[PDB]
Amino acid sequence: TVAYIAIGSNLASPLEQVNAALKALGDIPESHILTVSSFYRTPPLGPQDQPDYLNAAVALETSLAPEELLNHTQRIELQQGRVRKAERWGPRTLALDIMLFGNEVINTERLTVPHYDMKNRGFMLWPLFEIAPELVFPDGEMLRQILHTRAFDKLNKW
Numbered sequence: 243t244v245a246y247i248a249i250g251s252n253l254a255s256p257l258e259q260v261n262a263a264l265k266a267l268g269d270i271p272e273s274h275i276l277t278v279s280s281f282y283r284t285p286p287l288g289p290q291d292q293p294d295y296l297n298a299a300v301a302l303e304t305s306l307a308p309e310e311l312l313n314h315t316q317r318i319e320l321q322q323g324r325v326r327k328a329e330r331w332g333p334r335t336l337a338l339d340i341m342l343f344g345n346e347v348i349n350t351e352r353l354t355v356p357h358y359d360m361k362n363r364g365f366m367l368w369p370l371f372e373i374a375p376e377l378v379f380p381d382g383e384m385l386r387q388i389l390h391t392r393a394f395d396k397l398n399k400w
């Protein structure tokens with residue numbers, strides 16, 4: 243199954259954390275990285291004192307069940323990052339999100355796939371579009387169409 247995973251880091255110097263996370267993703271049992279998007283820099287909207295995020299998308303081939311994959315991404319979050327005691331704004335220093343999991347639709351207590359809010363997030367859509375411009379969602383929506391309908395500002399590279 244090809245799963246698409248979004249990575250976000252809000253560290254001031256996020257490169258080493260992102261690399262540790264990438265290596266960890268490739269180390270997941272029965273899985274390996276097919277492709278990684280460029281690293282993108284995404285703004286603090288409104289309040290400026292917020293730091294830039296590094297965002298990227300990863301295509302991961304995996305034979306694991308979706309919930310097993312989630313187990314691993316959550317483990318990697320716990321191992322490679324921390325929870326900011328500030329607010330809900332920036333929850334964790336490292337965020338791993340399962341955007342798509344093959345052509346599967348998932349709606350459980352633990353897992354909503356396609357990711358529940360990804361169509362609202364340019365920082366998820368643009369890096370994904372770089373590595374999968376032809377992507378079609380399980381319901382037939384098209385990544386290209388979502389970007390064509392909404393007009394999200396392009397992201398600069400890290």
Ligand SMILES: Nc1ncnc2c1ncn2[C@@H]1O[C@H](COP(=O)(O)CP(=O)(O)OP(=O)(O)O)[C@@H](O)[C@H]1O
Pocket residue numbers: 333334338339340341351352353354355356357358
């Ligand atoms: N596709 C998916 N990828 C990752 N986590 C997912 C998910 N679908 C559901 N979840 C759930 O999302 C929960 C965490 O949500 P919250 O932490 O409250 C918001 P967040 O994850 O900080 O940022 P987000 O809402 O921008 O994705 C997890 O406990 C996990 O069960």
Ligand SMILES: [Cl-]
Pocket residue numbers: 341342343344345346347355356380
């Ligand atoms: Cl999916």
Ligand SMILES: [Mg+2]
Pocket residue numbers: 337338339
């Ligand atoms: Mg999340």
